[PDB]
Q: What sequence folds into this?
């Protein structure tokens, strides 16, 4: 369910800086960009 | 950059339910069952899909339980599009029917629809997308995680910033050279996010989703279809296409008269003299000071006596601090309730040039009547010919108001787009302030457009001829009422180069009357920069040299003799081409055509053109390849497949002081470009009307005309001329114009008379220049009789013919 190609990821935190826990609590995927 | 926190495919969206078919198209209910992280989700929406034309698809997503803010806007056989729907998650899918290409697919991300946050996403068909003004950017927008903010803002143009105007329209190219356009009719603060998949997200802070899709298939057809909805460009007066000269710092009528004198003595054409804030009494609208400007009315009357026009700056904000009864614009505005009001119902007070100011509400019909009266009364004192409307974001020198702004959800919204200053209040008025139609929150991006509409109407009533309005702030559909200049550009090589993409972008958005301040506004120009900027700027559809208060002078007559010669040549060529430029504005006005256009609009099937934005065309036929860097004596430009004739091979007469043809297979060509030269090439197959010289259009319009005939290899060419009185209203409706087609075929040139009336009948044709004549003719005939005189150049293959003909009477010119 979190296997989305990097270029096709749509922002689930456009409103504020978010932590992994808050992101997952929203029902979203947390995967840091590699750069 | 790429988001670390992103939606899984299972993220809750809306579900489509009860899809139904209508005569117009489709209707459905959309239901969200899981709330988003934004407040005030609208859980039940109505979808309406309207199949309006074969090339226009329209859909709306609204709250069926509450009227929401909507932008005020005037209204084999098969469509080019097909539409399908995803049920869960909800999406609209639009295919191009001809090749099955997916143009729109909103299933790619969740639909968000909350009171102050709308988000709709789509796949894009390619990495090539243009539009979403106003930003300092390449014509083709970067898809590398780019956030584009639409929130009208007073800021000197710089990359990555929301600037003076907002145009929520994009044109997307498809592999093979087809294109489509998308218009989101939403005036709220918004971010548009582009990503490399490629995909786009609209993120708006209010209103509804009102979406138009234009199927093209040609880029020129997409622009025309968009302009069908927002309005075809207004027809300018002919004089408006002449040279305009302005600065901040012409501080008296004596100094302003010296500008015209100095231009005239140095043989520089000038149609329109401008003043900035200098004319006013204490920087107030509809006044003039009794020091430097005591004889302002006489100065303007004298300009008119010499065949010139006059323009001056008008700001929106009205001085509120004067003694009661001493300043009619404020006193009468107060009486009639014309101003934007605050929470207690009093005028919102900000700070602009005169000090404390109130802001007119141009959505209030009574404010329109007040503005008409103030313009008409001032015009009875000083007969100005148009209005330069500045600071109409609206610009505020303080944040919000003198009394600050209240703490509410409009001033402090749940989603703030990427605006400079990080707040909707920065450099403007309170978002929760009251206007007749809605709050400033919803109407801000329309403020400049509403002032342009009010000013257009005011000028029609005051003068009874075509209005001439130049506006800083704009919105989609602005071009129906007014033109634009790109604002406070620095006098730099970077801003000279950036002006080309920006002028092209506004032409795609239906604002063809656009230009940048020639030689730049801020800072000090150099002589070399001012020569190159005058050369390029002579191909801006709106050509004005304007200059800031603290800058060194940059009028053409203020430079060295060699620089003056180059600037004179540029102005001479523009004046010679005015009948052609006017005809291009006619095509914009009647058919939604562009005036200045990128190569990709004219040659979309040649993918090499897609990234070219440092060259421009005028219409189909004139390719301009400017030098945009210091120290350059050559330029490399792209030449699409065909023959391009050097315009230097066409004789042009001036009042004061290299390959003849490029044969291109579609390739980059290095051209000589010394300081005194700008490269201009005429496309084979085209005929251009030209007119003799003048220091004004009043003088030039009385001169004999000429044709430049660029033959194809097969000896063919086509062109046209539109002619009217240059300033009357309702010319096309009344039929008060002449329209002529020129055709070259089999060693002959003829005219075809589409319409001939008194306006145009007596136009004299005295010269015909034919490019691409391979062999010297033995004889040249005009209506069957050997001409008085002709010259043939074997080196340039140019045949130059003297004739005595009338544009409005059928002729036949022949050679062999
Ligand atoms: C709505 O706009 C009106 C103006 O149209 C605002 O009126 C301003 O109200 C402030 C007080 O809140 C006034 O300031 C006061 O001035 C007097 C002397 O002039 C001084 O003694 C007080 O200490 C204070 O500074 C201000 O004069 C007044 N402006 C005008 C032009 O009268 C009103 O506050 C606005 N309402 C909201 C809620 O923002
Ligand atoms: C989807 O529509 C159904 C049916 O609605 C009816 O038919 C339509 C053409 C229109 O004429 C409506 O006015 C009709 O009510 C909805 O289900 C009905 O819901 C109503 C009110 O809750 C109820 O009285 C009926 O018994 C239901 N009928 C059936 C056949 O189930 C349904 O709610 C609509 N869905 C959404 C999400 O709005
Ligand atoms: C529109 O976009 C949607 C979502 O990206 C596409 O649907 C997905 O397609 C993938 C890959 O084929 C499937 O494995 C998924 O199950 C689909 N997702 C959903 C939500 O259905 C869809 O293919 C696109 N439509 C078109 C016509 O291109
Ligand atoms: C118009 O040109 C005149 C003449 O060149 C300018 O007046 C001269 O300007 C210099 C300053 O650069 C003065 O020192 C000279 O005394 C002036 N000469 C004459 C003949 O009067 C004038 O400034 C120009 N005006 C504008 C508005 O450009
Ligand atoms: C623009 O120029 C202003 C005046 O500069 C002075 O006068 C001219 C004739 C030159 O000789 C110059 O070298 C002189 O210093 C400046 O006051 C102003 O700072 C300049 N603006 C910028 C942004 O550089
Ligand atoms: O210098 S400004 O901030 N830029 C505005 C405008 O953009 C300029 O064109 C104009 O000359 C100025 C004076 O009226 C305005 O003030
Ligand atoms: Cl999850
Ligand atoms: Cl949260
Ligand atoms: Cl409303
Ligand atoms: Cl690109
Ligand atoms: Cl009066
Ligand atoms: Cl109302
Ligand atoms: Cl290439
Ligand atoms: Cl290159
Ligand atoms: Cl004749």
A:
């Amino acid at each position: 369910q979190c296997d989305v190609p990097p270029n096709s990821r749509f922002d689930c935190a456009p409103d504020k800086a978010i932590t992994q826990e808050q992101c997952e609590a929203r029902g979203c995927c947390y995967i840091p960009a590699k750069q």
Remarks:
- The first strand of chain A starts at residue 29 and ends at 30.
- The pocket of chloride ion (ligand 7) is lined by residues A 24, 27, 29; B 8 (CB under 6 Å).
